[PDB]
């Protein structure tokens, strides 16, 4: 809860152009992996 | 319509001694054919620069040195920063170090944040990122590692980040610093601290990426080998 | 200003002025009015007639004319400035046109203030300017600081003088990195010879012995000379090993202490010096 | 029901199936739900939803076959590329 909330609100993916480094896709999970769970 | 120019530098003094309030109109009228550097240098002696601030805000377009330095000093005294960000972003004809000395000890989180910011305008990490360790565990020190684009800067950062047990937001320390990390040391220091929860999704993206890599490369090699036949 | 048809009426009067030898703040005033808030902001001989005249004033007026003029010849007037005493101004020129290489060559040659240039070069990032920097670090003998001015450049050139300053002060740990990466830029022999010399100086035996086992292409027995000339034993032991110079190694094994393998080196030497010195 | 997914030969049909299969905690025969549906699964989501339910026992052998397969893949491809590069010389 407060842990997942902490890491979530602290940083999270957004529509930027710096994703060209390695084209991250863990955003899709970590956004709502254990949040709401 | 006057021929010479010294009468400007006398008439500014004239008004300032007599009708200083009606000086801004002359300043706006007379800015074109005027060395504003001498104007600010003379005003620093008498020290009525806080009066003429909005005028210099207009003159800033010329991007003069003393103009920038003085108006930034006045933003410092006024304790305003939103305009300071626009000044430094839109204009760069000034030294960053002198401003940094004042901003990094301005009693205020935001000014010190700017003191950390403009260091990278000189391409000087290892002090900015380190400066904001002192106060900002709120993700800001973590973000400069990504734009730094330099390995063995996040590694030190993450190791320090585990020197204190604030593992909660370790998972973010790799999200933005993803490309600047090698899974070897990541897995090592993660198994060290007996942490895999909110550490695995790094390895998840990795075991997606390299799977796609090996599959794609097998496909390309099969294609090339099949085309070797013909 | 009323004229506004051609530069002939202008050329006549300004040539009369230029010939009249009018003192300072007489000719540049005409230029200061006609360049600003009017049409003739051009460069048709408006360059030195103002800028040199302000250099005949020797004032900060040059800076304002710079910041408030465009389409004007930068390189020639910069060289004229530095030919004179005004150098901050030409520095501001190359800063304005963003010509980093032309700037530090002028800063250092005029004043030599590395403290002002190193930060300017930190802001910029170019191997040319870093090479200028290392070249300057040599001038003060900043051998430790002449290196990072080559790390960001990876310019192996002038390494001979790097070596001339290296022996001047024992710093056999960072030259290691300089030469280790410059290896991949200049496949020379001086690099590898001085590399093994620095390695033996810092006694990095575990990889000093490994570098040699690859395509060294170096000159062993020339630094093997330096082993016993400086008397850093357990080094010529390894240099001469894969080179098989039985006769010179044993002179060092005298000082090593081993005797069993010394005679095994001598039996394959069978030289008078070898045998008698082992005895 | 588990067997028809293999012959279906259609991704995103076992994934729904396995997710439902964990909606009820019958993890016992989850290990079979990937044996026959092996090729129709990507280790990304597999590892994800397995770490979710804190299950690795009777889940690892999937990853074992995978860390056999792709090891052989990278080794074989390195061999073929070394062969081709060596033949580039002649």
Enumerate the residues of chain B whose CB falls inside 8 A of the CB of residue D49.
none
- Distant-in-sequence, close-in-space partners of B177: CB < 8 Å, separation ≥ 6: B142, B145, B146, B154, B157, B158
Q: Is B119 exposed, middle or buried (0-12, 13-18, 19+ CB in 10 A)?
A: buried
Cβ distance of D42 and B211 shorter than 8 Å: yes
Chain A contact for B186 (CB, 8 A cutoff): no
Cβ distance of B205 and A26 shorter than 8 Å: yes
CA distance B60 to B67: 7
Report the phi/psi class of residue C146: left, alpha or beta, with left for phi > 0 and alpha for psi in -120 to 50: alpha
CA distance C27 to B173: 64
Residues 42-61 of B with CB under 8 A from A: none
- Find the chain A residues whose C-beta atoms sit closer than 8 A to any C-beta of D: 29, 33-34, 37
Enumerate the residues of chain D whose CB falls inside 8 A of the CB of residue B207.
43-44, 47
Q: Is D14 exposed, middle or buried (0-12, 13-18, 19+ CB in 10 A)?
A: buried
The CA-based angle B144-B145-B148, given to 5 degrees, is 85
D to C contact (≥3 Cβ pairs closer than 8 Å): no
Nearest-CA distance C265 → chain B (Å): 46
CA distance C72 to C42: 8
Record the resolution, in angstroms.
4.7
Could you give the residue ranges of the DSSP H alpha helices within D1-90? Answer: 4-8, 14-23, 30-35, 43-52, 60-89
CA distance B158 to B151: 12
Touching chains, C (3+ CB pairs < 8 A): B
Cβ distance of B35 and C64 shorter than 8 Å: yes
Cα dihedral angle (B54, B58, B59, B64), rounded to 10 degrees? 90
Q: Which residue in D50, B161, B193, D44 sits closest to A10, CA to CA?
A: B161
For the four alpha carbons of B21, B22, B28 and B33, in that order, the dihedral sign comes to negative
CB-nearest to C125 from B36, B64, B123 is B123
């Amino acid at each position: 809860g407060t842990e997942w909330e902490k890491v979530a609100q602290l940083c999270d993916f957004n529509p930027k152009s710096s994703k060209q480094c390695k084209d991250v896709s863990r955003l899709r999970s970590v956004l709502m992996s254990l949040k709401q769970t | 319509k006057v021929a010479n120019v010294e009468l400007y530098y006398r008439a500014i003094q004239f008004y300032l001694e007599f009708k200083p309030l009606l000086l801004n109109d002359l300043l706006m009228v007379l800015s074109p054919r005027l060395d504003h550097t001498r104007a600010v240098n003379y005003f620093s002696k008498v020290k009525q620069l806080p009066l003429v601030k909005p005028y210099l805000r207009s003159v800033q377009n010329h991007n003069n040195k003393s103009v920038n330095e003085s108006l930034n000093n006045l933003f410092i005294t006024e304790e305003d920063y939103q305009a300071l960000r626009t000044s430094i972003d839109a204009y760069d004809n000034f030294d960053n170090i002198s401003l940094a000395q004042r901003l990094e000890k301005h009693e205020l989180i935001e000014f010190r944040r700017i003191a950390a910011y403009l260091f990278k305008g000189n391409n000087r990490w290892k002090q900015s990122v380190e400066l904001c360790k002192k106060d900002s565990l709120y993700k800001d020190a973590m973000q400069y590692a990504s734009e730094s684009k330099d390995t063995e800067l996040a590694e030190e950062l993450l190791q320090w980040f585990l020197q204190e047990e604030k593992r909660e937001c370790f998972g973010a320390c790799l999200f933005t610093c993803y490309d600047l990390l090698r899974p070897d040391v990541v897995l090592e220091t993660a198994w060290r601290h007996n942490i895999m929860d909110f550490a695995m999704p790094y390895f998840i993206q990795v075991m997606k990426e390299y799977l796609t890599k090996v599959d794609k490369l097998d496909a390309s090699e099969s294609l090339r080998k099949e085309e070797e036949q013909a | 200003l009323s004229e506004t048809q051609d530069p002939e009426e202008v050329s006549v009067t300004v040539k009369a002025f230029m010939t009249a030898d009018l003192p300072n703040e007489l000719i540049e005033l005409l230029e200061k009015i006609v360049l600003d808030n009017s049409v003739f902001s051009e460069h048709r001989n408006l360059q030195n007639l103002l800028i040199l005249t302000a250099i005949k004033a020797d004032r900060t007026r040059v800076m304002e004319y710079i910041n408030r003029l465009d389409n004007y010849d930068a390189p020639d007037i910069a060289n004229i400035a530095i030919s004179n005493e005004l150098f901050e101004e030409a520095f501001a020129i190359f800063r304005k046109f963003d010509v980093n290489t032309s700037a530090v060559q002028v800063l250092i040659e005029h004043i030599g203030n590395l403290d002002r240039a190193y930060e300017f070069a930190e802001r910029c990032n170019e191997p040319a300017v870093w090479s200028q920097l290392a070249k300057a670090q040599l001038q003060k003998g900043m051998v430790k600081e002449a290196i990072d001015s080559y790390i960001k450049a990876d310019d192996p050139s002038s390494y001979m003088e790097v070596v001339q300053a290296a022996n001047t002060s024992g710093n056999w740990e960072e030259l290691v990195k300089y030469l280790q990466m410059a290896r991949k830029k200049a496949r020379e022999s001086y690099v590898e010879t001085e590399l093994i010399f620095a390695l033996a100086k810092t006694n990095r035996l575990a990889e000093l012995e490994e570098f040699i086992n690859g395509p060294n292409n170096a000159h062993i027995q020339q630094v093997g000379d330096r082993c016993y000339d400086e008397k850093m034993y357990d080094a010529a032991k390894l240099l001469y090993n894969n080179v098989s110079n039985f006769g010179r190694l044993a002179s060092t094994l005298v000082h090593l202490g081993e005797y069993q393998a010394a005679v095994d080196g001598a039996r394959k030497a069978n030289s008078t010096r070898t045998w008698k010195e082992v005895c």
